[PDB]
Amino acid sequence: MKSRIIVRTSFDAAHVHGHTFFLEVAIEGEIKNGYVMDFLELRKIVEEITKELDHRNLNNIFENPTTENIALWIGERIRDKLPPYVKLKRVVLWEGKDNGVELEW
Amino acid sequence: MKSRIIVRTSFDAAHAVKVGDHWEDVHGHTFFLEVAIEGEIKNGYVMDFLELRKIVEEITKELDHRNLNNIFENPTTENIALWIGERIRDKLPPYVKLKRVVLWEGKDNGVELEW
Amino acid sequence: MKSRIIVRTSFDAAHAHGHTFFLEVAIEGEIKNGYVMDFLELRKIVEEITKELDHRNLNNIFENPTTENIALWIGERIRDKLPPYVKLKRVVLWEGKDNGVELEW
Numbered sequence: 001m002k003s004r005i006i007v008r009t010s011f012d013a014a015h016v017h018g019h020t021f022f023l024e025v026a027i028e029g030e031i032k033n034g035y036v037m038d039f040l041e042l043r044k045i046v047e048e049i050t051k052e053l054d055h056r057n058l059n060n061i062f063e064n065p066t067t068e069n070i071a072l073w074i075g076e077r078i079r080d081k082l083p084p085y086v087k088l089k090r091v092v093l094w095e096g097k098d099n100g101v102e103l104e105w
Numbered sequence: 106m107k108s109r110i111i112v113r114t115s116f117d118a119a120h121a122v123k124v125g126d127h128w129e130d131v132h133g134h135t136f137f138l139e140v141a142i143e144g145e146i147k148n149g150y151v152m153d154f155l156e157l158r159k160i161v162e163e164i165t166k167e168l169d170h171r172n173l174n175n176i177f178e179n180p181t182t183e184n185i186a187l188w189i190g191e192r193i194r195d196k197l198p199p200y201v202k203l204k205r206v207v208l209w210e211g212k213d214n215g216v217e218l219e220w
Numbered sequence: 221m222k223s224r225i226i227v228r229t230s231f232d233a234a235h236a237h238g239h240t241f242f243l244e245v246a247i248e249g250e251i252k253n254g255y256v257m258d259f260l261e262l263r264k265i266v267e268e269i270t271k272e273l274d275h276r277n278l279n280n281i282f283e284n285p286t287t288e289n290i291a292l293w294i295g296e297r298i299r300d301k302l303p304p305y306v307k308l309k310r311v312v313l314w315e316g317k318d319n320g321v322e323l324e325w
């Protein structure tokens with residue numbers, strides 16, 4: 001069996017057409033003493049990354065700000081900050097409520 | 106790593122499922138459809154969202170506003186989902202593959218098909 | 221191909237304050253006579269289990285009532301009430317709307 005904790009967040013950005021992006025992050029690991037990893041630590045890691053894009057024009061930070069590339073970047077940034085016994089499992093980024101990009105490791 | 110684009114849409118249809126040899130009472134729902142297409146991120150894209158949505162909505166269009174018991178012998182959520190999956194697969198460009206189809210009958214009950 | 225039916229339900233419970241839990245259960249099996257498993261039957265099985273949690277003191281049942289442990293608790297009792305030809309595929313438990321645990325078999 002595989003266990004994961006999920007956190008959902010959102011941020012607004014433009015690329016120009018501004019959107020409200022909904023981000024879902026799934027971190028996989030083992031349930032140790034009732035916890036995989038506390039939600040607040042993960043959520044802090046995630047927001048610390050999304051805040052760099054919040055209210056910005058992604059065309060100034062990304063060569064080509066496609067939802068896929070933004071999702072990719074976010075995944076790499078998250079990966080670099082997660083704790084030792086945990087892995088980035090899934091990243092789902094919705095460009096508005098009806099369209100999204102799912103990245104699964 | 107796998108990369109997919111997801112497109113969400115909805116359509117409404119009325120129907121009654123078989124409860125033995127006889128039928129339940131007819132009623133309508135808003136169906137929520139989630140389609141996941143997997144492929145490689147080329148030039149920053151897997152597949153254009155709108156291109157996928159059009160393929161999917163042309164399909165749901167045949168079900169939209171219709172009595173499903175007139176289209177399916179047994180309009181269960183699984184048979185409808187299967188039918189949608191097959192229709193989509195048949196229309197997808199040669200560089201992607203149908204990965205997932207999630208059909209919700211309302212927001213409380215749904216069927217998930219994965220390839 | 222794999223086919224699953226999914227049911228969503230909700231229950232409120234207190235532990236340590238109280239929360240509104242959102243549960244999503246996915247059952248994998250083959251489609252026979254047009255369906256994997258009757259939606260109501262699963263819903264019955266699931267809500268009979270959640271009924272034992274509804275507005276309860278979770279610390280009376282769990283030494284450490286974390287979201288993960290509660291998810292494991294539910295996953296197990298569901299596996300014990302399921303019919304012979306289907307399998308518990310996934311359990312997603314959201315404590316509130318933006319934080320959840322996902323168990324996958």
Ligand SMILES: C[C@H](O)[C@H](O)C1CNc2nc(N)[nH]c(=O)c2N1
Pocket residue numbers: 005034035036037038039040237285286287288315
């Ligand atoms: C009230 C809330 O349930 C409590 O603060 C927390 C915090 N962080 C958590 N983190 C995890 N992984 N699992 C949990 O159940 C909780 N619960």
Ligand SMILES: C[C@H](O)[C@H](O)C1CNc2nc(N)[nH]c(=O)c2N1
Pocket residue numbers: 017065066067068095110150151152153154155
């Ligand atoms: C406004 C619209 O969202 C934008 O032009 C698009 C269109 N199609 C897309 N298609 C993919 N695959 N990824 C994207 O980020 C976008 N963005």
Ligand SMILES: C[C@H](O)[C@H](O)C1CNc2nc(N)[nH]c(=O)c2N1
Pocket residue numbers: 122129180181182183210214225254255256257258259260
């Ligand atoms: C009204 C209700 O949705 C209808 O009677 C049901 C019940 N159980 C079901 N169970 C499955 N597996 N698939 C379905 O479409 C339904 N439909």
